[PDB]
Amino acid sequence: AAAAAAAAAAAAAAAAAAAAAAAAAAAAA
Amino acid sequence: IGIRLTLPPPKVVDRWNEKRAMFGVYDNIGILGNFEKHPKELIRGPIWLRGWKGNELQRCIRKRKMVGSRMFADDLHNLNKRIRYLYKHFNRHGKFR
Amino acid sequence: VKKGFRAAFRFQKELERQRLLRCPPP
Amino acid sequence: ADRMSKWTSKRGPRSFRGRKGRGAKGIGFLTSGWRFVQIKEMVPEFVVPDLTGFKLKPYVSYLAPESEETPLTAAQLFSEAVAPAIEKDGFEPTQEGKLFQLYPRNFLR
Amino acid sequence: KARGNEYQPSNIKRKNKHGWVRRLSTPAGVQVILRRMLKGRKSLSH
Amino acid sequence: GLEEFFDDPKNWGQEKVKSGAAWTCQQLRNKSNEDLHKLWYVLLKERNMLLTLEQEAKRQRLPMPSPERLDKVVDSMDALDKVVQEREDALRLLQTGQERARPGAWRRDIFGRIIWHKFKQWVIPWHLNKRYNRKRFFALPYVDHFLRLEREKRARIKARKENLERKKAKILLKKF
Amino acid sequence: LRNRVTDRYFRIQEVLKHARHFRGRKNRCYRLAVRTVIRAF
Amino acid sequence: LPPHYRYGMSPPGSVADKRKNPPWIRRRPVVVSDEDWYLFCGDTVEILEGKDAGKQGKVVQVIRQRNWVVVGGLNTHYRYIGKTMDYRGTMIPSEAPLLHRQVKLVDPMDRKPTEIEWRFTEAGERVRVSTRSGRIIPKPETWIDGPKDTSVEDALERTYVPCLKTLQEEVMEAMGIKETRKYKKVYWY
Amino acid sequence: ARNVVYPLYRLGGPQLRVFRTNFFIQLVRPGVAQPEDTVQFRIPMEMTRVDLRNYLEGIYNVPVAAVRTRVQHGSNKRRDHRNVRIKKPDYKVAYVQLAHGQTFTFPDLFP
RNA sequence: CCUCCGCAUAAGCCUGCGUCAGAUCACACUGACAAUUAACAGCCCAAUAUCUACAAUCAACCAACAAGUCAUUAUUACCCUCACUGUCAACCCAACACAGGCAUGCUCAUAAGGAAAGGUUAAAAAAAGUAAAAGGAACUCGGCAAAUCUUACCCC
RNA sequence: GCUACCUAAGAACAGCUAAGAGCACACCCGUCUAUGUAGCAAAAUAGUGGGAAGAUUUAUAGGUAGAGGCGACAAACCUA
RNA sequence: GCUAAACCUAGCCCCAAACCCACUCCACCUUACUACCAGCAACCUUAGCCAAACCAUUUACAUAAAGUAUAGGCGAUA
Ligand SMILES: [Mg+2]
Ligand SMILES: [Mg+2]
Ligand SMILES: [Mg+2]
Ligand SMILES: [Mg+2]
Ligand SMILES: [Mg+2]
Ligand SMILES: [Mg+2]
Ligand SMILES: [Mg+2]
Ligand SMILES: [Mg+2]
Ligand SMILES: [Mg+2]
Ligand SMILES: [Mg+2]
Ligand SMILES: [Mg+2]
Ligand SMILES: [Mg+2]
Ligand SMILES: [Mg+2]
Ligand SMILES: [Mg+2]
């Protein structure tokens, strides 16, 4: 019957994506 | 820094095992066993290359006409794909042609 | 882990030679 | 847009929230006015005895003796219905003419 | 315009397009569930 | 009476309840079908009395007085359920010879692997059931490629399992 | 991997012991060191 | 209990066991067999090696998994328990488990450790007998019932009459509930 | 009785009776100030409203007058160490109202 | 001081600012416990027969053209009786505690519902406004914007 | 399940002047300008607008598929 | 001296042999995971990228005979 205490569940989270192509622009002739 | 701090356990290999002491016995069984067997018979391994050197392609072809009948499904399909690739490499690609 | 022993042993024969410059013998 | 959650009765639209339910073994039937009718003979009625004067308790003592196991197989049941077969030197052929059919099982628990 | 609202959920339209019954009613959609029992997904269909 | 959901008020919160020795299944065979039908309804009131305690225990956060009797009430129950179903099966094999009281058959689904299709107890014969007639119990041989790929996926694991227990045996003898 | 090379630490320190006295980052990182120790020799 | 679970000194379903073995720990397994296991609970064993070697003890707990005996009050190391705050509490002696083959049962009449086998004596049958001498070794080791225990007498009344009368029908003959209808034929398929 | 096939009733079959019924019940302390005569249970999901009236009249012999049920959905948003959702299961809740004003309070064990 | 909101319902999500305890911009996260009670709403029909041209619109006047949203009878068969399920929240699709998207019935300024300023200093530059002498398009690709309200004609 | 078009069975259209009418809400659309450009937003906010009893707007379910669909033809639109 | 670093062992690959495995209860072709009602039905050459320096016929899916006879825009190659 010795003293102790409870515990906490602790992790993190990770994810990733990739949106689209890009940023239209201009040029010459 | 993948070098390791505490030195690893020492590998006590027994040179006088039952298998190293009897390594290579019953080879040379053709010359002085009056030619009943060949030393090519005594090896134990795959059934298709039971005494046959081959190449990287030739071991893949000989596996296909000998054992390729009773091969697993995806383990056949990833064996045909190699000969469809090694024929496109050993006969089309490289130097020295 | 790697299958080497001759590299960690040169490391083990180097880490004494960092000890005998940090904490010297009398 | 969940896939691993279990498909229950709370989840669809107002049409799908009425039809499924839980498997509560529905009683009567519905007809012609959305007026339900509870057939009393389908309602499971409990056949409970009177426990008054009954000597058995929901446990026993530890001082009762230990014996070995004996599963009651069909052969051990026949060796005590053979007592009217030794006089001949009881059976049902059909399962139709019985309120409690054995093979296409008919009773409950 | 605003191009994120592409999935307007509707539980009838979910189950009547990717449900268990619609997959089985055609010989091609059986092979979809056989390609997921083989892969061992915890959910076969919707 | 709702005072059967609780035991008598002389052990209400004694933190310990003296109740041991559940009904073992060997002892019940000496009892008949008569008192066993009673004993269930005795054992029913005893199981209901114990679940009322524990969902009041968690409700006020204090621990259970003695959950060591709680597994006794199901062990007396599950043994009794085994006895009556040992007894009914012992006469059902005599009367008809029929194991599997609920009738069924072996049938092949569309998914190839056969199932013990248990029977569904209708009131019209099966050529008239419109719901049953769209259930298709056959092979349709385009699935037989997928049949080999589960016989293979089963067996490669079995080779992978049988490989582990030889390698786990080798380091046992090489340590001892 | 069969034959993954262990003794990289003793290959780095063959250059860095002539690079313990440099300025900036080149006295630490190996990619920036050999662009100087090659020019230093 | 998860696979590759380490069975500590602590019992496997404890509050303190989830401290040391939480459901995410994956420590490498431990090497252990052969069900003829001459150690029982409470055996007067003597110690083969370790510290406090040579002293004889009675074991108080045996763990079949990691091949462990807990020698009672012997081979200790001293720990603190409780102590709840910034003070010492109590230093108690706690014993460490001793492995199989670190342990030998002693001669009950002679007080020497002895290797023990299983021989099949005709008295019945398979008991622990020493190898050096004969002289078999046994296995070592007021309730009054409550209001929901029946008795020693009520357990084995032998009430069963074995008739072929189908229990759900056996209740109605004693209850006297009459049923007048019959069951009509369902299509079971 | 749950998880057994109920035998079928066509038109002139017998009264469907149950011997040694499967399920079990538990009474609770109501937390939301129920009125008097209303006691509350946790019904196993496969048990009907009129079956509870038959259960309590036959086994517990208490004068039930009105039963009212609900399907209390259980907490699904609880996650394990593999980020997988672990459900605490859902159950029924029945509000049995007694007859004749018997006025039963929930007692206080653990004084 | 706002209110460009709202309270329901449908649709969806499925416990997600209830209680206690906790560990840990600032004290909706976690552990345990509780909850939403049908009467509203879903969940309907015993057959073969056989019927049913005249809109709607305040339905009357009048006028329609694009020509319309709602109906039984005759015989046979019918006496068991109130189950099942939705009922929570600050919610939803847009990776977000996202100025976005979001059908209907009510309230049309609220009896609902909320808070633009972390604390100072009042530099440039930038954005949003408000005001401005005299002149009023001299600006500029163009009266673009902003203010005011109007004249006339082309091309297609 | 967005969108093109269709099909079923539904819905909305305040007020004011007198009809693919006009002014004008709700509502749908997106002309011009500024802000925003890793943004509040993988197409927006603010004004300013154009239609708003109809070739209208939109909820629900069903249909048409890539050698194709569909299209008041922009080679558009068919899950950024 | 902080971040960190270092770990063997889970397990696995490749074989050899051997032919593998489906009903605790209940639920599962309707909206699968739902106790309970008057209709349908399976068998169709793979094709191409690629190679021929483009490309259009063509281009592979025990040992020894042998890469031999043959086929082939007689060419690539088979
Ligand atoms: Mg509500
Ligand atoms: Mg986005
Ligand atoms: Mg207010
Ligand atoms: Mg603020
Ligand atoms: Mg501030
Ligand atoms: Mg001026
Ligand atoms: Mg000018
Ligand atoms: Mg302007
Ligand atoms: Mg108009
Ligand atoms: Mg207009
Ligand atoms: Mg158009
Ligand atoms: Mg054009
Ligand atoms: Mg080419
Ligand atoms: Mg080329």
mmCIF file of C-alpha atoms in Angstrom, chain G:
data_model
loop_
_atom_site.group_PDB
_atom_site.id
_atom_site.type_symbol
_atom_site.label_atom_id
_atom_site.label_comp_id
_atom_site.label_asym_id
_atom_site.label_seq_id
_atom_site.Cartn_x
_atom_site.Cartn_y
_atom_site.Cartn_z
ATOM 1 C CA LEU G 1 22.889 -3.571 -45.572
ATOM 2 C CA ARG G 2 25.844 -5.844 -46.161
ATOM 3 C CA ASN G 3 28.987 -3.740 -45.561
ATOM 4 C CA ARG G 4 27.727 -0.417 -44.363
ATOM 5 C CA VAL G 5 30.830 1.618 -43.639
ATOM 6 C CA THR G 6 31.419 2.099 -39.928
ATOM 7 C CA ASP G 7 34.620 4.138 -39.552
ATOM 8 C CA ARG G 8 33.407 7.476 -40.886
ATOM 9 C CA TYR G 9 34.442 9.206 -37.661
ATOM 10 C CA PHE G 10 38.091 8.384 -38.204
ATOM 11 C CA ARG G 11 37.827 9.566 -41.794
ATOM 12 C CA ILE G 12 36.390 12.946 -40.818
ATOM 13 C CA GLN G 13 39.067 13.557 -38.191
ATOM 14 C CA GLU G 14 41.864 13.010 -40.690
ATOM 15 C CA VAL G 15 40.948 16.445 -42.080
ATOM 16 C CA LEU G 16 39.531 18.231 -39.040
ATOM 17 C CA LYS G 17 42.690 17.960 -36.950
ATOM 18 C CA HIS G 18 44.148 20.392 -39.479
ATOM 19 C CA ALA G 19 40.898 22.365 -39.157
ATOM 20 C CA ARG G 20 40.530 22.826 -35.407
ATOM 21 C CA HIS G 21 41.748 26.442 -35.671
ATOM 22 C CA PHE G 22 39.705 27.853 -38.573
ATOM 23 C CA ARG G 23 37.328 30.845 -38.517
ATOM 24 C CA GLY G 24 33.575 30.622 -38.707
ATOM 25 C CA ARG G 25 31.713 27.445 -39.650
ATOM 26 C CA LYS G 26 34.555 25.713 -41.481
ATOM 27 C CA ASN G 27 36.150 24.544 -38.251
ATOM 28 C CA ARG G 28 33.067 22.422 -37.527
ATOM 29 C CA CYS G 29 31.276 21.095 -40.598
ATOM 30 C CA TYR G 30 33.020 18.660 -42.915
ATOM 31 C CA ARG G 31 31.542 19.935 -46.186
ATOM 32 C CA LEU G 32 32.873 23.440 -45.560
ATOM 33 C CA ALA G 33 36.175 22.162 -44.167
ATOM 34 C CA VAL G 34 37.508 20.244 -47.155
ATOM 35 C CA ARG G 35 36.845 23.233 -49.357
ATOM 36 C CA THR G 36 39.512 24.965 -47.238
ATOM 37 C CA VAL G 37 41.880 22.177 -46.130
ATOM 38 C CA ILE G 38 42.333 21.231 -49.778
ATOM 39 C CA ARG G 39 43.141 24.877 -50.479
ATOM 40 C CA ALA G 40 45.126 25.124 -47.246
ATOM 41 C CA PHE G 41 47.519 22.402 -48.308
#
